[PDB]
């Protein structure tokens, strides 16, 4: 039903995506022929040509409480070509004070505006085959595609008038949209605000689309967890060598770190075993420090013109620790994760996790995905990331080798 | 003949205009060639004359193949070519014969002139211009123009594919049953249907190929097993390498051994054991190629072990879509892995090898989860699937490993199988200080400008050292002193470091390094029973480390 396309235009020099397909499993090749097959139908893709030579990933994931196939488009290259992305939309700084966030999808949504004939070549995929048997099936889209950051860009009108009537009626929720999820915030007890959501989804299906009780989220209960500093009645040398390192790092990061009372008690060459009794001065600033410690962290501030950047570090027993910056050491956020009952035996099931936890908490926190150092091989994470992932956006990553004491300093 | 086939809108690059590249005056025999070539093609449609209006033009040339007198027309589209918009990629991979699936009947259909039967965009043809010059210069040559997708252009193998595509497509959804792999102008089909439904299923496919302006070989004219394709032997039930010959020679040169282990990695897909490391060490520096380069002791211990592996015809088998997979990985010596891929016990569809990281410090564990990783992605871009593995290393071994390593690590389903030499973990650190164990602060230290550096330790039982080095770097004096400890110590130590550096290669349990030096390191900790290594923070008042730092700094700024 094509109503009037907005013309979209890429970067000037900026020209389209061609990235490699990465291969596929047989069962997620027949999932997407299927799924895909059944879009032409519906005429949101249709076949192409060799003459378009342009490319973007395509893979086929299961969200939670879902058994069903669905299609999921790496469009992170033609994200960073695209913006116009121009007229972005406004991220709300209420949505992380709110006692409960709702995350809602909405891109069903998108497949009903038309996209601009003239950008339909550059969101051009394929459909691989096994053993390279036959060609790969490509199409393009003809309507916003999902995955895109140019959809929710283009649909902005067409969502405010769905969500006006709601608005008017509930002034105190906050919605935000990012990508193909809304992002909803009220104060309510937990019961008023699930009846509000439940209204908010009939609101959504007047439209067509259908918006599935989804993940409940509490930025209230957010608390950036201190880097922590031992309790113990005797300490070794090795405790206090251990104890140096930790503030001597930390002292990077808050100015107000001392360390010279503690250093004292490290002289001479002694055995790493021997206890050693600490000095009433040492026990203020230690005390000092973890005052200092449990507070966030003076001069540090949200820079919209940088990207962000997360760390993980795998603690072992199922935990991980992360911190999300923009300048190394100048944490704007930092926390933990701990595998929920079932991943009992799988690293890369708990990164996966871990990640769409840390970008989820970006996108409230900040409206926008972090820059992941992931501590894993590349080809690993290639290989296995969508076996588990859940998401339908996709944050940019790299691979590096986390650094020993990293890990300590974070360790809890 | 020419295909009804629409065709494919093609462009020039956007701030682009045609090509416009003047005739070289050619021979008076090189002439006569072209205009008998090109009046042939013009009475089959490929080409067509213009007016004087297309401004356009490309080279054209005229060779003559030896052992006859037959002229050959050679268009130079080097200049259209960069012009020429970007498409495609035909694919993606080239089909690997282990993933063929087992079929009672296979046949081989290439598409006679290929490119010659597919139109060209009318649009574009205008581009295509070329001359034929007059003996001489003496006036206007012959122009024509192409009307089908034309010899070294850069859209033909593109839009051939595409076409292709196009045209199966109809006779893939009335027969979902029969499988074809396009490649090239290569046409491979197989069915389970007995000889007879087959050879009608052939026969109605070349006649829709046909009706669609592409000729075929009839029966008699079809190829027939054993099939030469891109390198492998083709039989109904079986594959191999193509007959591999490695030549017997005095004196080899760099360019014999490059052939070598071309020819030896190529034939390590089935062949199992093929070690190719002690000749790559050969082609090192090599800074020629006609040089002459003397083979190593081990060299031509891998060479014959090689022939040994090679003087038996080996066999893969086809993929049964109904069976698991099975991989399989010993490993055959320092950073070197084979593997094997098979459904029913020894029954190979495919072999391999693994061998990377340029010992950039790593361990057995570390090593063969990386070819698991090699053999997962192979898997699936060969069968679709990731195959059950069979590990020469201890559950409990790879336990320990991954649970207390950093990085997240993960491998699929595997059993052990205990095949010699087992994969394990030489030596590890201890988790907290060790009582009554000699503490030594060792440190390291090295002038920028000099290269010149000092490295050694203090103890808490008042032992002292300290040796100089030259041309070092400050890394290689944190790993001498830790040396230095461990080679002054005895059974039982404990070391504090203020090298991150160290501590990070040491922590990581590796068994095998390209540094001399992180070797002997190595060595020596596997002769201990009891190593705890430590950091702490550099130029700090931190007893030990501060006083290292005085006696090695020492006369090294
Ligand atoms: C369905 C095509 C096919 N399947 N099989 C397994 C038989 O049980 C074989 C071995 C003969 C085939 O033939 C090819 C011949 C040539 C040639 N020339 C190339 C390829 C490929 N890929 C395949």
Not at chain 2, 2 to 9: A, D, F, M, W, Y
Not at chain 2, 75 to 101: M, Y
Not at chain 2, 306 to 322: A, Q, T, W
Not at chain 2, 361 to 377: M, R, S
């Amino acid at each position: 039903s094509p109503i009037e396309t907005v013309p979209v235009k890429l970067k000037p020099g900026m020209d389209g995506p061609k990235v490699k397909q990465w291969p596929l499993t047989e069962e997620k090749i027949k999932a997407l022929v299927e799924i895909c097959t059944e879009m032409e139908k519906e005429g949101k893709i249709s076949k192409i040509g060799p003459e378009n030579p342009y490319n973007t990933p395509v893979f086929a994931i299961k969200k939670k409480d879902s058994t069903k196939w669905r299609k999921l488009v790496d469009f992170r290259e033609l994200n960073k070509r695209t913006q116009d992305f121009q007229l972005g939309i406004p991220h709300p700084a209420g949505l992380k004070k709110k006692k409960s966030v709702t995350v809602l999808d909405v891109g069903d949504a998108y497949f009903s505006v038309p996209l601009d004939e003239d950008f339909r070549k550059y969101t051009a995929f394929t459909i691989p085959s096994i053993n390279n048997e036959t060609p790969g099936i490509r199409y393009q889209y003809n309507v916003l595609p999902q995955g895109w950051k140019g959809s929710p860009a283009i649909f902005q009108s067409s969502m405010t008038k769905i969500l006006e009537p709601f608005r008017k009626q509930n002034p105190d929720i906050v919605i935000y949209q990012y990508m193909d999820d809304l992002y909803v915030g009220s104060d309510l007890e937990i019961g008023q605000h699930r009846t509000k959501i439940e209204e908010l989804r009939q609101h959504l299906l007047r439209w067509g689309l259908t918006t599935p009780m989804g993940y409940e989220l509490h930025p209230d209960k957010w608390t950036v967890q201190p880097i922590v500093l031992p309790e113990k009645d005797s300490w070794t040398v090795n405790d206090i060598q251990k104890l140096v390192g930790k503030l001597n790092w930390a002292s990077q990061i808050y100015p107000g770190i001392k360390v010279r009372q503690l250093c004292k008690l490290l002289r001479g060459t002694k055995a790493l075993t021997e206890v050693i009794p600490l000095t009433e001065e040492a026990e203020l600033e230690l005390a000092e420090n973890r005052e200092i410690l449990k507070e966030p962290v003076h001069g540090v501030y949200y820079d919209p013109s940088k990207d962000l950047i997360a760390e993980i570090q795998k603690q072992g027993q199922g935990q991980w620790t992360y911190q999300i910056y923009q300048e190394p050491f100048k944490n704007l956020k930092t926390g933990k994760y701990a595998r929920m009952r079932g991943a009992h035996t799988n690293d890369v099931k708990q990164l996966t996790e871990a990640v769409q936890k840390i970008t989820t908490e970006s996108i409230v926190i900040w409206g926008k995905t972090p820059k992941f150092k992931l501590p894993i091989q590349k080809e690993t994470w290639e290989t296995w990331w969508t076996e588990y992932w859940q998401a339908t956006w996709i944050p940019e990553w790299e691979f590096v080798n986390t650094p020993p004491l990293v890990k300590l300093w974070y360790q809890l | 003949p020419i295909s009804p086939i629409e065709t494919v809108p093609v462009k020039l690059k956007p701030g682009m205009d045609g090509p416009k590249v003047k005739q070289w005056p050619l021979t008076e025999e090189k002439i006569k060639a072209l205009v008998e070539i090109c009046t042939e093609m013009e009475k089959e449609g490929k080409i067509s004359k213009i007016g004087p209006e297309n401004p356009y033009n490309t080279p054209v040339f005229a060779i003559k193949k030896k052992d006859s007198t037959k002229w050959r027309k050679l268009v130079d589209f080097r200049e259209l070519n960069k012009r020429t918009q970007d498409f495609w990629e035909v694919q993606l991979g080239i089909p690997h014969p282990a993933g063929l699936k087992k079929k009672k009947s296979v046949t081989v259909l290439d598409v006679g002139d290929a490119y010659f039967s597919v139109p060209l965009d009318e649009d574009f043809r205008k581009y295509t211009a070329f001359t034929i010059p007059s003996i001489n210069n003496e006036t206007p040559g012959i122009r024509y123009q192409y009307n089908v997708l034309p010899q070294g252009w850069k859209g033909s193998p593109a839009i051939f594919q595409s076409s292709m595509t196009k045209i199966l497509e109809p006779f893939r959804k009335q027969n979902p049953d029969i499988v074809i792999y396009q490649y090239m102008d290569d046409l491979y089909v197989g069915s389970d249907l007995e000889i007879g439904q087959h050879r009608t299923k052939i026969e109605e496919l070349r006649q829709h190929l046909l009706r669609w302006g592409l000729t075929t070989p009839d029966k008699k004219h079809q190829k027939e097993p054993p099939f030469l394709w891109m390198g492998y032997e083709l039989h109904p039930d079986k594959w191999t390498v193509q007959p591999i010959v490695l030549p017997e020679k005095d004196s080899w040169t760099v360019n014999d051994i490059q052939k070598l282990v071309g020819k030896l990695n190529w034939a390590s897909q089935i062949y199992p054991g093929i070690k190719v490391r002690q000749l790559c060490k050969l082609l090192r520096g090599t800074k020629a190629l006609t040089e002459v380069i003397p083979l190593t002791e081990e060299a031509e211990l891998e060479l014959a072990e090689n022939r040994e592996i090679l003087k038996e015809p080996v066999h893969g088998v086809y993929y049964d879509p109904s069976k698991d997979l099975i991989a399989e990985i010993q490993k055959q010596g320092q950073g070197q892995w084979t593997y094997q891929i098979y459904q029913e016990p020894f029954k190979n569809l495919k072999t391999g090898k693994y061998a990377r990281m340029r010992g950039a410090h790593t361990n057995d564990v570390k090593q063969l989860t990386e070819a698991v990783q090699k053999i997962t992605t192979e898997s699936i871009v060969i069968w679709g699937k990731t195959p059950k593995f069979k590990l020469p290393i201890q559950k409990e071994t790879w336990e320990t490993w991954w649970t207390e390593y950093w990085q997240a690590t993960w491998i699929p389903e595997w059993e052990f199988v205990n095949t010699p030499p087992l994969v394990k973990l030489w030596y590890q650190l201890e988790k907290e200080p060790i009582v009554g164990a000699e503490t030594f602060y060792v440190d390291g230290a090295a002038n920028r400008e000099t290269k010149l550096g000092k490295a050694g330790y203090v103890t808490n039982r008042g032992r002292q050292k300290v040796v100089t080095l030259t041309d070092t770097t400050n890394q290689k004096t944190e790993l001498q002193a830790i040396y230095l400890a461990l080679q002054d110590s005895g059974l039982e130590v404990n070391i504090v470091t203020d090298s991150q550096y160290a501590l990070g290669i040491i922590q990581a349990q590796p068994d095998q390094s390209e540094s001399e030096l992180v070797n002997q390191i190595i060595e020596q900790l596997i002769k201990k029973e009891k190593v705890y290594l430590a950091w702490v923070p550099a130029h700090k008042g931190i007893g030990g480390n501060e006083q290292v730092d005085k006696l090695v700094s020492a006369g090294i700024r």
